[PDB]
Design an enzyme around this catalytic site. Sequence first.
Site, PDB file in Angstrom:
ATOM      1  N   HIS A 109       0.840  -1.143  -0.142  1.00 22.78           N
ATOM      2  CA  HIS A 109      -0.055   0.021  -0.101  1.00 22.78           C
ATOM      3  C   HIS A 109       0.843   1.400   0.082  1.00 22.78           C
ATOM      4  O   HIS A 109       0.345   2.325  -0.395  1.00 22.78           O
ATOM      5  CB  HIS A 109      -1.015  -0.019   1.332  1.00 22.78           C
ATOM      6  CG  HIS A 109      -2.026  -0.916   1.124  1.00 22.78           C
ATOM      7  ND1 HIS A 109      -3.100  -0.903   0.163  1.00 22.78           N
ATOM      8  CD2 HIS A 109      -2.556  -1.876   1.957  1.00 22.78           C
ATOM      9  CE1 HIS A 109      -3.803  -1.865   0.314  1.00 22.78           C
ATOM     10  NE2 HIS A 109      -3.642  -2.350   1.363  1.00 22.78           N
ATOM     11  N   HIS A 115      -6.721  -7.115  -0.200  1.00 23.80           N
ATOM     12  CA  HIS A 115      -7.102  -5.675  -0.751  1.00 23.80           C
ATOM     13  C   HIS A 115      -6.266  -5.323  -1.920  1.00 23.80           C
ATOM     14  O   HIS A 115      -4.852  -5.966  -2.266  1.00 23.80           O
ATOM     15  CB  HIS A 115      -6.648  -4.872   0.544  1.00 23.80           C
ATOM     16  CG  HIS A 115      -7.351  -5.027   1.717  1.00 23.80           C
ATOM     17  ND1 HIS A 115      -6.821  -6.331   2.189  1.00 23.80           N
ATOM     18  CD2 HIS A 115      -8.142  -4.478   2.303  1.00 23.80           C
ATOM     19  CE1 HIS A 115      -7.531  -6.169   3.394  1.00 23.80           C
ATOM     20  NE2 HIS A 115      -8.370  -5.194   3.547  1.00 23.80           N
ATOM     21  N   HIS A 116      -6.689  -4.350  -2.703  1.00 27.13           N
ATOM     22  CA  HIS A 116      -5.870  -3.864  -3.790  1.00 27.13           C
ATOM     23  C   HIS A 116      -4.737  -3.096  -3.537  1.00 27.13           C
ATOM     24  O   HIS A 116      -4.388  -2.575  -2.252  1.00 27.13           O
ATOM     25  CB  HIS A 116      -6.786  -2.717  -4.410  1.00 27.13           C
ATOM     26  CG  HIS A 116      -6.207  -2.038  -5.490  1.00 27.13           C
ATOM     27  ND1 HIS A 116      -5.406  -2.475  -6.695  1.00 27.13           N
ATOM     28  CD2 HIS A 116      -5.847  -0.759  -5.430  1.00 27.13           C
ATOM     29  CE1 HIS A 116      -4.993  -1.461  -7.414  1.00 27.13           C
ATOM     30  NE2 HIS A 116      -5.307  -0.490  -6.847  1.00 27.13           N
ATOM     31  N   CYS A 117      -3.582  -3.655  -4.129  1.00 27.08           N
ATOM     32  CA  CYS A 117      -2.159  -3.013  -4.009  1.00 27.08           C
ATOM     33  C   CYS A 117      -1.864  -1.636  -4.454  1.00 27.08           C
ATOM     34  O   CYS A 117      -1.162  -1.410  -5.324  1.00 27.08           O
ATOM     35  CB  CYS A 117      -1.211  -4.023  -4.575  1.00 27.08           C
ATOM     36  SG  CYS A 117      -1.532  -4.327  -6.316  1.00 27.08           S
TER      37      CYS A 117
END
Length: 372
Positions: A131, A169-171
Site C-alpha cells: 500500500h 485488498h488492492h495493492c
Amino acid sequence: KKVKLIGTLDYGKYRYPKNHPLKIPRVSLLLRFKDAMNLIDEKELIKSRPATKEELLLFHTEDYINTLMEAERSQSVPKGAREKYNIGGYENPVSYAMFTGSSLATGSTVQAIEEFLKGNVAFNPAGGMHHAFKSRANGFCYINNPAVGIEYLRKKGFKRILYIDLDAHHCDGVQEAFYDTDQVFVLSLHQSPEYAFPFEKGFLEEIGEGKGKGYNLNIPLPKGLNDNEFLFALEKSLEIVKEVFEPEVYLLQLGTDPLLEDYLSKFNLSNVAFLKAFNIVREVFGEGVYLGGGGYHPYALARAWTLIWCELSGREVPEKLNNKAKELLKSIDFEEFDDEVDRSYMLETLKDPWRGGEVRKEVKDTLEKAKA
Ligand SMILES: O=C(CCCCCCC(=O)Nc1ccccc1)NO
Ligand SMILES: [Zn+2]
C-alpha cells in the site's frame, strides 16, 4: 536449488500498538510454529537484514524516508508529517515497526530476490507491504517492499516484471508505482473498492496510463467470495496476462487475509484454495519470488503460510497439529472479533475443508469485462 525462508523472531519486538490489527505476532509466530511442527530446519532459514537507505530509495523519496527515521527514534510525529506523510495516525502510528521492522521486512524482499536470482526458491512472509506510496504511509504500510523489490530488478536489467497480488485488498501502492510503465505488469484480485480499503482505487477500469495503459489489471471481487469464485478469477485473469505479457520474472504476494477467519476480509476462502491459488500461479508462470502480506488471524496466518512452506519445502503436510503447535497458538492473545464464533477447530488440523460454491454472475461479468 535450495528452498529458503527469510525471517527472524525479532519482528516480534516491532509490533503495532495494542489497538492495532498488527499488534499480534505474525512472521515471528510463523517461525515458532513450524519449529514446533518440526517443518523447518536451520539450513533453510535466512536471517533478515535491514534494507539499505539506497535500496529504499529505489522507490521512496528521501524526505519521506528521513521522516520515518526521525519519527521512529524520537518516537514522535514531526510537525507537518501527519498531513504530508500520513504518519502518526491510528492507521500508521509511531512505533519501532514504522521504520526498523519495515526496513527489516523490505531487506528481506531483496534477500528473497537475491536468492531467486541465484537459482533458489525463497519466501519472505514479512514482505508484500503493497500500500505505501512514494512519499506516504498508507494502510498500515510505511515502506513498499514490492515496489522497492521491483525497482531492484529494473536496475538489474529486467524489462518485463510481473506482479500478482492475492491479498484481499488492492495493492494501490504497487499500482501507482508502475501505472505509467509497461515494463511492470501489475495484477490484483482483491475486495472491491466499493466496500473495502483502499476504497479510492482498485476498480476494474484502472488499466493504466501512458505506455502502461493495459498493464494494470484490477480484479474487484464480491463479499462472501468462496473458493471456486476466487480460483475462477485467478485462472481467468492469469490468462489475460499471459496473452499480453511474457514475464522474465514475477513476484507473488500471498496475504492470508482472504481467508474466512480473517476479519479484515469479507471472503470465505479456505487454506486449500489458498494453497491452490499458489500452485496455479506456479503452473502458469513457473517459479518466482514469493512474498507475504496482510493477515490478522494468528491461526489462519500460521496454518496457511505453513502450507506454502510445505509446498515449497517439498514436505508432506501433517494432517494434524502436534501439541506444541496447538499450545503455541493458544498462548497468543488475539481475542476473536465476533465474540464467540469458536475457531478452536482450526487447532484440530492444518488443511481445512474446501469452502467451494457456485460462481456468481458478478464474478463472471467482472472477468468478462476485464477480458474485453
Ligand atoms: O490488510 C490490508 C488492509 C489494511 C487496511 C485496513 C484498515 C481498516 C481498519 O482500520 N480496520 C480495523 C482496525 C482495527 C480492528 C479491526 C479492523 N492490506 O492488504
Ligand atoms: Zn490485505
